[PDB]
Amino acid sequence: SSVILTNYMDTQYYGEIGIGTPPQTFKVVFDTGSSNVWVPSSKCSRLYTACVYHKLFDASDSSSYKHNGTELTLRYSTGTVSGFLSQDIITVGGITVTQMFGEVTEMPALPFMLAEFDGVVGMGFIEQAIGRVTPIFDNIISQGVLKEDVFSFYYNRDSENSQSLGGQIVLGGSDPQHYEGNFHYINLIKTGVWQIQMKGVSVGSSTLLCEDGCLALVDTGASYISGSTSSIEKLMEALGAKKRLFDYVVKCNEGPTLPDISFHLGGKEYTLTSADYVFQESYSSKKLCTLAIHAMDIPPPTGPTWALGATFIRKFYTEFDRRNNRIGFALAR
Numbered sequence: 367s368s369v370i371l372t373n374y375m376d377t378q379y380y381g382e383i384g385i386g387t388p389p390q391t392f393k394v395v396f397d398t399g400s401s402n403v404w405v406p407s408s409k410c411s412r413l414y415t416a417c418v419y420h421k422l423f424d425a426s427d428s429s430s431y432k433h434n435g436t437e438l439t440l441r442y443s444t445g446t447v448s449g450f451l452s453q454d455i456i457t458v459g460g461i462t463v464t465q466m467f468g469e470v471t472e473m474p475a476l477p478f479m480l481a482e483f484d485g486v487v488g489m490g491f492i493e494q495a496i497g498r499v500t501p502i503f504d505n506i507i508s509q510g511v512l513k514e515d516v517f518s519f520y521y522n523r524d525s526e527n528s529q530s531l532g533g534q535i536v537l538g539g540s541d542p543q544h545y546e547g548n549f550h551y552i553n554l555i556k557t558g559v560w561q562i563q564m565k566g567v568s569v570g571s572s573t574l575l576c577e578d579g580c581l582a583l584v585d586t587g588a589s590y591i592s593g594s595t596s597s598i599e600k601l602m603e604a605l606g607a608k609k610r611l612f613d614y615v616v617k618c619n620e621g622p623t624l625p626d627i628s629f630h631l632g633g634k635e636y637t638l639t640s641a642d643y644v645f646q647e648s649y650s651s652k653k654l655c656t657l658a659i660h661a662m663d664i665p666p667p668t669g670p671t672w673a674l675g676a677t678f679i680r681k682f683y684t685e686f687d688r689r690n691n692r693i694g695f696a697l698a699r
């Protein structure tokens with residue numbers, strides 16, 4: 367099965383899923399960076415404005431709902447959500463699985479008021495599941511209907527005309543329609559995390575970063591490519607970028623000229639051009655231009671690690687192989 371994804375300003379990729387009977391729909395981000403499923407709850411006080419602006423699942427309208435109520439708190443690098451567990455049938459572009467998800471009752475205005483999506487579907491391993499809840503992919507695999515134990519991601523570039531698909535996620539394989547050349551796999555450092563060994567990072571012709579090696583987290587639920595506060599400060603100085611509050615800007619006229627940034631993974635340089643990582647929204651020297659790379663200190667046991675999010679996936683079609691515990695990359699088409 368494949369799921370059409372909507373691309374919102376190149377920073378948010380989501381698709382639809384139905385929960386309960388009759389189906390209650392939600393826009394969700396398929397996150398290889400987390401392992402739980404959650405959507406806003408009707409029990410969420412309207413004092414939480416974010417709940418006022420998103421779809422809320424109502425248990426009392428689902429004849430297939432199974433109560434549980436165990437509390438859970440999900441913690442992401444850029445925000446937190448809290449609530450309790452519930453069970454019901456979830457629809458994912460064809461497949462139907464009885465999933466255990468979290469009904470969020472605390473959805474902070476900042477940042478969720480900025481979210482176009484309603485919730486999250488974790489595509490990570492159970493080792494990272496909060497509350498030891500079985501991840502949705504594990505369940506789908508159990509059904510034994512998928513052609514292969516893998517899922518692929520395709521994140522298209524932004525578009526000013528609602529006629530091109532913002533992205534697509536395939537359950538059980540890849541879609542040749544969106545990649546060229548062959549994949550090039552890398553082995554997961556440790557199973558339970560979509561993290562691989564990254565040999566080095568280069569900014570132009572001078573591998574000034576991640577020498578000696580470092581970690582790379584392939585996060586479909588993250589907007590940009592991130593690095594330790596240290597690594598980024600050093601990468602950003604090399605680009606002549608200034609550090610703002612939430613991002614790094616560069617004078618727009620200097621954006622097209624910026625150097626390439628390469629990530630050495632499994633022996634193959636994945637190169638990104640300035641056009642690939644800069645939000646060139648102007649050419650004025652009197653305007654600032656946001657870079658699609660941020661600084662995000664990810665704690666143990668996962669970090670310190672770089673995070674390859676949407677900025678990286680837009681250029682490289684990614685396939686997550688559960689059966690071989692490996693990640694594959696191919697030129698996105």
Ligand SMILES: CCc1nc(N)nc(N)c1-c1ccc2c3ccccc3n(CCCOC)c2c1
Pocket residue numbers: 377378379395396397398399400442443444445477478479480481482486585586587588589676
């Ligand atoms: C999908 C959940 C998620 N997973 C992971 N691994 N990291 C995150 N930082 C987030 C997380 C949390 C809140 C918001 C969040 C809140 C408001 C606006 C945008 C937001 N984004 C970016 C969406 C990127 O989609 C590809 C968020 C991401």
Ligand SMILES: *[C@@H]1O[C@H](CO)[C@@H](O)[C@H](O)[C@H]1NC(C)=O
Pocket residue numbers: 433434435436451
């Ligand atoms: C909630 O689900 C977990 C997972 O199986 C289960 O162990 C627990 O007993 C459930 N709690 C209730 C009260 O339904």
